[PDB]
Design a protein around this ligand. Sequence first.
Ligand SMILES: [Zn+2]
Lengths: 60, 154, 128, 78, 99, 204
Amino acid sequence: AKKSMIAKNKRPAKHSTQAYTRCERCGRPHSVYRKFHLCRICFRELAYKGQIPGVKKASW
Amino acid sequence: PRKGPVAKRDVLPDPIYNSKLVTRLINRVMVDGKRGIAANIIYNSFDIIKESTGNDPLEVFEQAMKNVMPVLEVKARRVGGSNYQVPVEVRPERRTTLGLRWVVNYARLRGEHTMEERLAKEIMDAANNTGASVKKREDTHKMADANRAFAHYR
Amino acid sequence: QVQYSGTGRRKNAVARVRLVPGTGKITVNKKDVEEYIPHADLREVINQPFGVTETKGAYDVIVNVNGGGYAGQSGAIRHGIARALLQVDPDFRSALKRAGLLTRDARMVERKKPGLKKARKASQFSKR
Amino acid sequence: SLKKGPFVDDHLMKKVEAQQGAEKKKVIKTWSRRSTIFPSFVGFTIAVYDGRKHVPVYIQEDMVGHKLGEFAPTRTYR
Amino acid sequence: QKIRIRLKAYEHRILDQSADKIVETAKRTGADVSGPIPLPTERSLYTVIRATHKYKDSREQFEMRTHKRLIDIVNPTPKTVDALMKLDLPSGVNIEIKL
Amino acid sequence: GQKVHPIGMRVGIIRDWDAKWYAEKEYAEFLHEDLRIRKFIATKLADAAVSTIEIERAANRVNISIHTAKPGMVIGKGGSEVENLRKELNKLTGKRVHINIVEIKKPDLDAKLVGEGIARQLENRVAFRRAQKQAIQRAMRAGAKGIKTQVSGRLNGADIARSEGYSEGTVPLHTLRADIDYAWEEADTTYGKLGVKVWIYRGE
RNA sequence: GAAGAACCUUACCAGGUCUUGACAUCCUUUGACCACUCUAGAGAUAGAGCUUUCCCUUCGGGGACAAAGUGACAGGUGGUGCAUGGUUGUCGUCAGCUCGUGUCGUGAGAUGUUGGGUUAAGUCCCGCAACGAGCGCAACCCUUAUUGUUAGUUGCCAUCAUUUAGUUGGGCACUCUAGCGAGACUGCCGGUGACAAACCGGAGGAAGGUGGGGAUGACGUCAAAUCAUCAUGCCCCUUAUGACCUGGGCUACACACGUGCUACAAUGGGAAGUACAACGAGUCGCUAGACCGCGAGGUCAUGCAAAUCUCUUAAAGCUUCUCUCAGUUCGGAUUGCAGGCUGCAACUCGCCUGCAUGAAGCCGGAAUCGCUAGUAAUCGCGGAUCAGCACGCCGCGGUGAA
Ligand SMILES: [Zn+2]
């Protein structure tokens, strides 16, 4: 029930408090980094492949 | 714990009396890391010591140690599924720790309005066979030797 | 004239000790001895290297301390002074190594672990 | 706290107006959620909508401060 | 004087190799370049839980790291401006010049 | 499941990323544009089957480059397909893309190509044990220090899933002076879906 | 799962509704649409209005585009984790798990991997028909603990002057910033031990016995969890279990259980004056200063795309008075009134301020939980998602135990 909703979220909103955040390549409503427009776990998958610049592992 | 004996952490002496015993006395008053308040009310306790029947500011603490410090305690050393606790001589550092516990950790119960009359006069009282911590040791020795016969062979 | 150097560090607090032949005091951040160092009794704490080297004075002390909490930045004053007393005379380094007051406390706040309440405190877990 | 006055929608006003000199009508079908009451709205008879039912209620002059949301209890605890 | 540039990248080796190249080309036609002043190197963290449905009691994190260098130039020639506009590469660092 | 993508362990230490950017205030636009860039080689991968694409970036230019083992279909007949791919990529980009072709050597010692080939034998109903063994031998014939292999799912068109794989040579997995590779690829003949994994090791 | 439920969020309801469709690909007719004002309404929509639009012209045409026809088709957050891939818990950072060659056994197989010592460990020495190797363990990685070189602004002030003021003249001296480097390996000595591994002390040093932490999770177990991130074998729905909109609900409460916050006051409450951190964030974002307000705050405005400007002068801290043991100047829930802020809109259902109110609660049975040192205990601060909303989560720092 989301292929209509992803196209719903590409439209200009009816008013200001409707343009929420979801992921781009998937459609998750929860836990999306707005700096990256990715969810928690597609970010995790692309983080290992060296396909996101910046990000490394973090030990200190 | 399981493998061998552990180290025991000797401490630093005072900034005034140069005492490790009074330092340990401060550290069994200290709650939530507030050391300066407990240290300052213990110096206030020494000031109450010095005025009312001022004899020696530290000998009164050593006589408070005199009338409290144990020599005996039972310990549940069963062997084959029994209840034969043995009155056993105590380690000397645990002995002094039980003494500090019976002095300070019983002094919550005086209930007087001035906040260190339960401290200063309380350790004044323990110098000369008064204070209920002496009779704590008395009843501790009396419940000791209750199995003097059938436990001292182990 | 000549001045005597020294530095001391503890508990994420750093100090720059500037020892001068004086009368025996300390000025910290252009203030007095116990205006910026509050009610704490930490005088013979700081004067404990003086009790093993040049008892008790008479050298005034300049220092500009910053960072950390008050007791940690107080304890770092001890080590720039002892480093300075090593700078003056070699004949006290035995008297310092018997007394310590030279080894930096490397022990500071411990890293947490993502998954607990604290650095080692675990949450309550009901068995039944 | 609505410091710049009351709030009543303008697509609430458009059912009837000519009941000012005559005896009022009975049908007021609405949504009855957002709009508060201010004294020009006294003594009507409104079918207050509670998500399922435009429940009829008429107005007293001291049922006057709160919105139209007191009289749409959407819990059904019986 | 009328020039100071900035360096921001991710890898300090690429930073100081390109910084040594531009210091080598700095007093070529000019003079009196200031060296590679370091900068406190801002850092971020994140938090991603190691599951897809549950299990928040085990997590995972990453980091952003932004290394920053700084090279100042005092009393320059006019000839180094057209020289430095002929200097364009590498591409891993982005310069930030003023006048 | 507990293990880690090993290229996500060694990155930053003994290799780098595949996007050498440094971008503020236009970062996610280029991220979800590079996401579109990676998808477009599905036209390649049926025939050209490249392994990695390194994407560097100038001020206003796009400067990409690929690695592959098959230089035939990617260079076209006379480079005419190359400019067509530049045009079709620029139609999605609008920006000056300047593509490049770099040929890999000792091509059997990849990660993605070997797993893609054994998934190709799985997509023609060829038996999994013999294909894995001849694959790890022909990778050992290339000259290496070790290959690990594992396949899972409903094996060989059967019922409830098993998972089994074979290995030879040495493979220090838990060590950081490693320089190893890794690749995962799906597989399906018609039944369900399968998966292959593949490993090499050649010293630091 | 939920690292942010007023509408949206949504899949759950009452209603208003629609159909090659809310979304994808081709065909022709055609080619480019739109966008915006007025009326109806709760909205989807309906009826008008300005007109739409060629980016090759070799009169020959499709690329940016709509509408119509049906044709292909689309769509399912519907089922099956016991048909799946991928991913993750748990034993558990437990110390195991195997191979080649040579031997033993008629044979399945065994020995190596057993015994003595020692260790955090299949870590190492000695005897042993076994000799060697691999995946694990350890090492290489990150941070913290000293110091050399290099480079000195937006950093610091020692050699002097100034100014509220390291400000401005000046220096890179100290500090700091972070690149390249050195440094801790039983390294030396003494005892114990079969002289062997190893154990116990000493000197040196910043740390001496893997210095302190982190990342790193073998063979395998539990048909453990997941079609509701994703992909998907098979089965079912299709003028509808698919789609658009309004309003409601997941925030109920006769009850029982788990997890956290605040108290039952004198190491304390209330009033006054008075100091020292660390991490990180900032363009439609943080706010300097000023004026006014009991306040939540309101207005004019200055710096800031950053070691410079702001968040931001931290709380426990320290000194004086206070209260005098009470259900109390403890406690701070509940309830009327008055407000402030973002939101189109705080009734269902945001946060905060002020006035009036002031309940339980004086350390909690049976039982049960966490923790061996910068730890436990207490105290503040920052960030994610975010118009708005945190006693939750992630991270830092102060005081500092038995
Ligand atoms: Zn995603």
